[PDB]
C-alpha cells in the first residue's frame, strides 16, 4: 500500500541479513528474465538471491544500524542495476557459477559496436535465398553445396560505429554475434569484510 507493501520488503530484508554473514552483490544488467530463473534455487542449502529498488534498500539498512551497525561497510556498492546473493556456502563456489551463465547476447538491434566486426570465409550453410541478406552489406556470396559460401573476408562494422539493422539482421538472424552478456560481481561480503573480485 502507501507503505505496507514497501514494508513487506523491509521485513524479508533483515530476515536474510542476519541469517547469512557472507553475501554477493551482483551486477544485473543486460541480463534476462529467464537468465535469472536458471539456477535461482541452485544450492537450496545456503545460496539465495533477492533484489529491489536501491533508493528503498538504502533507507532499510540505514535504520538497521541502531541495532547491529556492522553492515554500514556495505552501502558504497548499491549504486546501479545491482542485486544480492546471500550465501554461507564456500565463497569461491558461488563466483564461478554466477559469472558462468552468459546468455551470449544475440545479437544487436541497430545498437553500437565493440570493434572491427569481421565476417570470415568458408561455407555458412544457410540455404540460398538468404543470399539477399548477404548482398545487403556487400559480402561476395557464392552458392557451393546448395548453401551460401562467403569469399573474401570483409569487415562488416567498423570500430565501434552505429550498426544498421541490415548489418544486424545478418549477424543476428543468421550468424554469430559475438557480443556476450552475463552477470557480474561488484563486491563480496563475509562477516563485515568487503572482499573484491579476487578468488
Partner 1 sequence: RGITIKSTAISLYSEMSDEDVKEIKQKTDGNSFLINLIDSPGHVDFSSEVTAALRVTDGALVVVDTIEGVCVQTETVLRQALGERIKPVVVINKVDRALLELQVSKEDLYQTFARTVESVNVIVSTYADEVLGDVQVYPARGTVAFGSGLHGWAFTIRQFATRYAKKFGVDKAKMMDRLWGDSFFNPKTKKWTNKDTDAEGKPLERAFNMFILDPIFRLFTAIMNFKKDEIPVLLEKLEIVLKGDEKDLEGKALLKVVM
Partner 2 sequence: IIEPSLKALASKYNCDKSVCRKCYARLPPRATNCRKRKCGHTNQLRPKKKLK
Partner 3 sequence: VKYLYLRAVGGEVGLAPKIGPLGLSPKKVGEDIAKATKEKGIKVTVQLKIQNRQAAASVVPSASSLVITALKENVKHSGNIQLDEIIEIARQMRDKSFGRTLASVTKEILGTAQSVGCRVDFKNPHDIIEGINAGEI
Partner RNA sequence: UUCAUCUAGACAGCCGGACGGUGGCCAUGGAAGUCGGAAUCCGCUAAGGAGUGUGUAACAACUCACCGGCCGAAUGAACUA
> Per rule CB under 8 A, is residue 152 in the interface with partner 1?
yes
Does residue 125 bind partner 1 (CB under 8 A)? Answer: no
The three-class DSSP label of residue 126 is coil
Minimum gap (Å) between residue 153 Cβ and partner 1: 8
Nearer to partner 2, 149 or 167 (CB): 167
Q: Does residue 28 touch RNA according to CB under 7 A?
A: yes
Of residues 166 and 180, the one with the C-beta less far from partner 2: 166
Q: Helices (DSSP H) in the chain: which residue ranges?
A: 4-19, 33-37, 54-63, 91-98, 131-137, 165-174
Kindly compute the dihedral angle of the four CA atoms of residues 34, 37, 38, 44, in this order, to the nearest 10 degrees. 180
Tell me if residue 188 falls in helix, strand or coil.
strand
At which residue does the C-alpha cell 552458392 appear? 143
The site for partner 2 (CB under 8 A) is made up of: 164-166
Binding site for partner 1 (CB under 8 A): 128-129, 131, 134-135, 138, 140-143, 146, 151-154
Binding site for partner 3 (CB under 8 A): 37, 40-41, 44, 127, 146
Amino acid at each position: 500500500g502507501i507503505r505496507e507493501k514497501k514494508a513487506e520488503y523491509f521485513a524479508k530484508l533483515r530476515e536474510y541479513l542476519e541469517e547469512y554473514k557472507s553475501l554477493f552483490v551482483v551486477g544485473v544488467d543486460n541480463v534476462s528474465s529467464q537468465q535469472m530463473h536458471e539456477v535461482r534455487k541452485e544450492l537450496r542449502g545456503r545460496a539465495v538471491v533477492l533484489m529491489g529498488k536501491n533508493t528503498m534498500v538504502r533507507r532499510a539498512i540505514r535504520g538497521f544500524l541502531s541495532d547491529l551497525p556492522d553492515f554500514e561497510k556495505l552501502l558504497p556498492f548499491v549504486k546501479g542495476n545491482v542485486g544480492f546473493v546471500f550465501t554461507n556456502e564456500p565463497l569461491t563456489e558461488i563466483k564461478n557459477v554466477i559469472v558462468s551463465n552468459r546468455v551470449a547476447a544475440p545479437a544487436r538491434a541497430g545498437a553500437v559496436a565493440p570493434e572491427d566486426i569481421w565476417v570470415r570465409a568458408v561455407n555458412t550453410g544457410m540455404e540460398p535465398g538468404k543470399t539477399s541478406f548477404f548482398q545487403a552489406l556487400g559480402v561476395p556470396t557464392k552458392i557451393a553445396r546448395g548453401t551460401i559460401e562467403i569469399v573474401s573476408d570483409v569487415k562488416v562494422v567498423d570500430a565501434g560505429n552505429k550498426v544498421g539493422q541490415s548489418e544486424a539482421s545478418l549477424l543476428n538472424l543468421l550468424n554469430i554475434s559475438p557480443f556476450t552478456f552475463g552477470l557480474t560481481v561488484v563486491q563480496v561480503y563475509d562477516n563485515g569484510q568487503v572482499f573484491p573480485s579476487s578468488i
